Amino acid sequence: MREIVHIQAGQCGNQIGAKFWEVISDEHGIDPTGSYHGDSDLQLERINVYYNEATGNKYVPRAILVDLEPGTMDSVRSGPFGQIFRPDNFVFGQSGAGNNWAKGHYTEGAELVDSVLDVVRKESESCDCLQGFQLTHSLGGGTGSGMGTLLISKIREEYPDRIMNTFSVMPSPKVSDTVVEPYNATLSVHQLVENTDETYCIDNEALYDICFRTLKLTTPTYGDLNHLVSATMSGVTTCLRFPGQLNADLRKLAVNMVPFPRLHFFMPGFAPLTSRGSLTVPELTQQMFDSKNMMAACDPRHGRYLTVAAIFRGRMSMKEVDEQMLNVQNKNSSYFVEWIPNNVKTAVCDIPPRGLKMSATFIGNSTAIQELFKRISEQFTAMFRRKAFLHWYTGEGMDEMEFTEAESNMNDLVSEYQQYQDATAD
């Protein structure tokens, strides 16, 4: 339980995946060339989780970069850390997928999937004890959604005993008003329920509303949204990259966060919410469970928490954190299921993120996430009832029954969240 193989697919997957490496390298003391410039030994103690150590004390991210669009590869290399990636790990096709889930999953991306699996095996066999795989992608496109889910299925076949973790970006008309995105998202959710052990739901609807209404950014860009993503991806992986009082790994997270196999979609939250350019412990605990701080556009007070994991970063009293966390569970006791005792776990890490002194990252398995899937299901149904643009998919080998099964499995997932939201202990 040590090394994680990171994969990123599509424009969104490579864009937010690049920012992820820029953030954690800055926290570990790694420069764009790959040398350790840090001043604390706690930065290299678990550095092997995400990086491969080469000769000359040179750390290389254990990352695989995939996309059917060749243009995304050039934008990554022109980035600040574009040179730190192993050039053999760039697997880029010739023609894009054109926001078509059927292209990435059945035609175009199916031709390139074997070229990606070869790079996965080479990285996996270079691991002392492979922990699992980490994928970043969007669900609204064609490559990260169609081929991303295809990659998950094949990797799941060859490495069935390893954890599959995704950072999946949910589509929103407020950001990209392309009407086939509800198709691609629903088809991917059908795949994510079966083939992933834990999924972080990052909602562009939530990211936009945070930038527009909270950060007062009049016209948010992808960089404004990705700033919130990288801060969240840094927080959720803190206990994997630093020692701490717990030997946390991807499997211990899944065992203690996922009470039922299908309900493995997490609602992440971050505090404080800052923007590029611009705090007590009771403020962090309060602001963490606030609906405005959730990276998924859902009100947690409309559902119940099945499991909650909270990460605090910075200098603070672990007794005060224990007292404040125990306070929130009493005022909001009705928002926690009572048939899972001690379902809130807290970790404190000394090293805080860049530009911040106090941080609070929230990972919740809440039944309120059904609001996210109800939204996508309604848009999907509005399009699917009129059979709009269905030939874009059926013309690539997709059977029309695959849409009905994705919709059915989508609605079944919502019913299961509602089922445990209403269940009591008696």
Binding site: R251, F260, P341, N342
Partner: protein
């Protein structure tokens, strides 16, 4: 002299094992390199401390202990700690991947890949014994390795060592310093599977040790180091009769004779007094009567329960230090005039007394002050059924919804084993109710 082998399973068992053996050395005068100057016979012997320590030709005194864990982080700290030269390197066994807080991983999948190596190393220590009497097993309830692997180990030990006794030191889970949500699952699963392979089990309630650290030692937020130093002081008081000359509980058989009237009800309650903070170095010394009265206060017990709600089936008082036997008699005669102490109709309503006239040793760096006299009370009371009731309730809340069960079934375990383990716990509760 009959040798005893200690087995330390999982993080809790290893770390508690580290603090115990450190204390054992200070009590016996053994240096971190294994040298014991007061040992007149070099290369062997028949003294009482030889039950726990073997001797090499070079005068080195090696613990009869095996450390096992499915991941190496915790055990690696022993390989580089203060007592790294004390243990055989082959006694410290580590895997690569732990049980992920999953009983089934520790018992069925991951545990099977190292079980045979552990037994072969145990057999190596057993062959060096002239009269092996049994094993002491240290492990947690809530850990995947501490529960899943321990159950697997105790099963194989009953086959290879049928007549030998097996004693447990188990760590009862507490919400304050817990690790996993599924710790109630692992606790019930390992209790059901080990119940028939264990002759006597001393439960340590982490919540009880936690509160004693806050209230008696004035430690605001206790850590595993604070709890384990206190726990080792109690474990030392329980095993002192095996390592020193004495008249009470001189071997593992007398533990069951004195504390276990029936096999299934083999969970004695331990009480330790006095627990004084090291900052109060010039504290007044408590009398025999004062520390004896403290053994019947619920605030001094290693498991949270009310002995006034239950009946006693056995009671052993182990004293250490400046203790005149006639003062114990008078102190007991006062306890016999208390309604809070009720014995069952069928047991001889008496207290067994054993006195070691050496005061307790304190570890440098510990939170405990030196005392001239201390007492550990080992008693079998039906009030410890409350601890099983709290654990069964947490199990029932999650299992009624079948929460987290797929993680166990996915590791080669039939779902019916949950109900079979739960029904056995329901039977254990009735065993206490039928007694009292």
């Amino acid at each position: 002299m009959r040798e005893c082998i200690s087995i330390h399973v999982g993080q809790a068992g290893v770390q508690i094992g580290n603090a115990c053996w450190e204390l054992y050395c200070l009590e016996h005068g053994i240096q971190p390199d294994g040298q014991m100057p007061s040992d007149k016979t070099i290369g062997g012997g028949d003294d009482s401390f030889n039950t726990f320590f073997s001797e090499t030709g070079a005068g080195k005194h090696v613990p009869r202990a095996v450390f096992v864990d499915l991941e190496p982080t915790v055990i690696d700290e022993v390989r580089t700690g203060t007592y790294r030269q004390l243990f055989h390197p082959e006694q410290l066994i580590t895997g690569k991947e732990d049980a992920a807080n999953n009983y089934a991983r520790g018992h069925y999948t991951i545990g099977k890949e190292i079980i045979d190596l552990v037994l072969d190393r145990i057999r190596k220590l057993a062959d060096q014994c002239t009269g092996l009497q049994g094993f002491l097993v240290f492990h947690s309830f809530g850990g995947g390795t501490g529960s899943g692997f321990t159950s697997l180990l105790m099963e194989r030990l009953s086959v290879d060592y049928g007549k030998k006794s097996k004693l447990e030191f188990s760590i009862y889970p507490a919400p304050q310093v817990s690790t996993a949500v599924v710790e109630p699952y692992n606790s019930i699963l390992t209790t059901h599977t080990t119940l028939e392979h264990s002759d006597c089990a001393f439960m340590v309630d982490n919540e009880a040790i936690y509160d004693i650290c806050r209230r008696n030692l004035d430690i605001e937020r206790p850590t595993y180091t604070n709890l384990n130093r206190l726990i080792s002081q109690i474990v030392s008081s329980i095993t002192a009769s095996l390592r020193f000359d004495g008249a009470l509980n001189v071997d593992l058989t007398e533990f069951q004779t004195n504390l276990v009237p029936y096999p299934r009800i083999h969970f004695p309650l331990a009480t330790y007094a006095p627990v004084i903070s090291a900052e109060k170095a010039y504290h007044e010394q408590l009398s025999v009567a004062e520390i004896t009265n403290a053994c019947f206060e619920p605030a001094n017990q290693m498991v949270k329960c009310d002995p006034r709600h239950g009946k006693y089936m056995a009671c052993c008082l182990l004293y250490r230090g400046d203790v005149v036997p006639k003062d114990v008699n008078a102190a007991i005669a006062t306890i016999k005039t208390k309604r809070s102490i009720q014995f069952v109709d069928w047991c001889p309503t008496g207290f067994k007394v054993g006195i070691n006239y050496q005061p307790p040793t304190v570890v440098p760096g510990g939170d405990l002050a030196k005392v001239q006299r201390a007492v550990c009370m080992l008693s079998n009371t039906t009030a410890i059924a409350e601890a099983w009731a709290r654990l069964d309730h947490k199990f029932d809340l999650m299992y009624a919804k079948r929460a987290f069960v797929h993680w166990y079934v996915g590791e080669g375990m039939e779902e019916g084993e949950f109900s079979e383990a739960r029904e056995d716990m329901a039977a254990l509760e009735k065993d206490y109710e039928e007694v009292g």
